[PDB]
Design a protein around this nucleic acid. Structure first.
Ligand SMILES: [Ca+2]
Ligand SMILES: [Ca+2]
Ligand SMILES: [Ca+2]
Ligand SMILES: [Ca+2]
Ligand SMILES: [Ca+2]
Ligand SMILES: [Ca+2]
Ligand SMILES: [Ca+2]
Ligand SMILES: [Ca+2]
Length: 294
DNA sequence: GGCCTCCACTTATTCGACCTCTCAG
DNA sequence: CTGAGAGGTCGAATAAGTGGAGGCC
């Protein structure tokens, strides 16, 4: 395998990767609970390469199928979690996931002292799990009532580097060739779109993208209860003089790099105005088709 | 015995990706 | 006519999670 730049790896960990803390009822321990702390990243089968290069970069973690179409990288071996702590202490996360890392860091110290084998240590872990990701199940809520959960700090940090954004984009980014039917002679408009999806927790971070990249805007989407944000750039001059030069200097990792490469091919056709012709339009449809089924 | 670590595989919901239209210059 | 938003839809490569058990000191 090949190494991954640490900042690119952190950025990819802001977009992918989830900390996890298992607190299960268990008959084969005195305290009656089985604990499992770790970190994981789940991608499509086609992107198993990233996991292998991560596994080789950190020298930690195990790979396993995640259903019929996906695979994951899991790090739960306790001694291997030191690498995860060492990496993120030097290359910290900047999304709200950094608050989950801190809770993960606290759980590590409880288990490091072996306090998870006691009833008090478990209670401490439960107070931490209450604020980690999706909190506690009602089964444990009623099991450990009147527990003062730990406080979850609001993360509001600046983008550290451009490499961080390359990794974050590879995880939650998208390079799309928009074909828009138009009641006109040619019939269709071509328009490149660069976007980054993200939960509305990080509205601050998302908004700062406009300031950091000097272009784009924000779009608030809602699916009933749930809402998230999209950082979107469509103005071609910005895509040509900002987005494209940026990601040529700071390589994307995974299958998204292939989409970026075809994306840039369409940008070339557009610079030459070949997107107003007919032969050029067949070319753009071929490139776009190669990005959907590919 | 007591406890750790891994594979199988799912759920909820947060992404990615896919549209189509208005309208000013 | 064209470009740049405006205004969306939608399915799971979503982010997060669980059951089962082989493995080790
Ligand atoms: Ca993400
Ligand atoms: Ca994922
Ligand atoms: Ca190792
Ligand atoms: Ca394996
Ligand atoms: Ca492991
Ligand atoms: Ca260190
Ligand atoms: Ca992704
Ligand atoms: Ca332009």
């Amino acid at each position: 395998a090949s190494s991954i730049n640490p900042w690119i790896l952190t950025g990819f960990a802001d977009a992918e990767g989830s900390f996890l803390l298992r607190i299960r009822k268990y008959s084969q321990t005195r305290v009656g609970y089985l604990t499992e702390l770790g970190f994981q990243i789940t991608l499509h089968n086609k992107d198993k390469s990233i996991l292998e290069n991560i596994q080789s970069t950190w020298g930690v973690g195990v790979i396993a199928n995640s259903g019929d179409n996906a695979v994951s990288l899991k790090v739960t071996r306790f001694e291997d979690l030191k690498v995860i702590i060492d990496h993120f202490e030097k290359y910290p996360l900047i999304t709200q996931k950094y608050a989950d890392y801190m809770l993960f860091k606290q759980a590590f110290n409880v288990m490091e002292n072996k306090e998870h084998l006691t009833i008090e240590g478990i209670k401490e872990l439960v107070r931490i799990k209450a604020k980690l990701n999706w909190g506690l199940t009602d089964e444990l809520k009623k099991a450990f009532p009147e527990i003062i959960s730990k406080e979850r700090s609001l993360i509001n940090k600046n983008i550290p580097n451009f490499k961080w954004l390359a990794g974050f984009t590879s995880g939650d980014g998208c390079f799309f060739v928009n074909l828009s039917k138009k009641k006109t002679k040619l019939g269709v408009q071509v328009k490149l779109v660069f976007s980054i999806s993200q939960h509305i927790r990080d509205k601050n971070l998302m908004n700062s993208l406009i300031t950091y990249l000097g272009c784009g805007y924000i779009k608030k989407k809602n699916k009933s209860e749930f809402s998230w944000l999209e950082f979107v750039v469509t103005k071609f001059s910005d895509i040509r003089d900002k987005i494209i030069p940026f990601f040529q200097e700071y390589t994307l990792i995974g299958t998204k790099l292939k989409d970026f490469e075809d994306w840039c091919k369409v940008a070339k056709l557009i610079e030459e105005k070949k997107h107003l012709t007919e032969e050029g339009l067949d070319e753009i449809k071929k490139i776009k088709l190669n990005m959907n089924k590919g």
